[PDB]
Structure formats: structure tokens, C-alpha cells
Design a protein around this ligand. Sequence first.
Ligand code: NA
Length: 156
Amino acid sequence: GVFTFEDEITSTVPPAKLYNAMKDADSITPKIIDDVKSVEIVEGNGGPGTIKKLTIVEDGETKFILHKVESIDEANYAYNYSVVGGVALPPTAEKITFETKLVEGPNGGSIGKLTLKYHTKGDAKPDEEELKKGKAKGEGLFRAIEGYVLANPTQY
Ligand code: NA
């Protein structure tokens, strides 16, 4: 089964810029996140369908996460990707998607929804903590991306 959660948020950065930064996740993430060290394309051209491998060190031990790029709606400032392998997936959970949608803000800010789709195996329901870890993680990347942009205004 699949279980969906939606969270709403705002940013001072206009959505067009956040979106650009969002598309450049491979580049930025290793810089902003201490534990992320690299992102490599395994197969695909960076578009939807692409499979990526993230290398991390956590508590000094190297680990791998596997991502799939789900869709892109540039006109709509939407960037979606799923965690398809690695540390975030318990056996009941087959995948976890993170979707980010941005809309025009009142103050030349961005209005955005973070959607988490938790796909479990069979009738299993999501673990409470995994869900909590996943929400924090989604929100975390968004903030990190926002931070990079504030730090560097003209890059995007
Ligand atoms: Na790093």
C-alpha cells in the first residue's frame, strides 16, 4: 500500500530560483550536508527515470543510498524523487517518495507543498518513527537548498 502526507511551507526565495537549485541537488547536496559526500548517476541522463547513488559517511561508516528521479514539471516548479534503496528502507517499505511543489508567493517568496508518499509492502502500514524520520529528512533538504540559495543569491 501507499500512504501520503502533505506539509505546506514558505520561503523568502522566489520559486523560480528554488526550483533551479532543486534541479542541481547532485552538485549542492554534498557541499551543504556534511555526511553526504557524492552523488553519481548510475543510469539515465538526470531526467525522470534516472537512478543515482549517494555516498555518505555516518558515524564514520560509509553507506549508500539509492534514489530514483520520479518526475519534473519545470513549468510547475516541481521536483520529485524517491528513495529506492539504502539506509532509509525497512523491508516492509519498498520505497519512499519526496515531492516538492512550489508556487508564487505574496512577497516574491515561494509557496510550497512537501509531499511524502510512503509505499509499504502489502498491507503493512508505515512505522511511526520511519515516517517521522522521513518528514524531517524531506524538510531538511528543502531548508538546505534554501540556505545555499540565500548564501549565494546570483548563482540562481
Ligand atoms: Na559533504
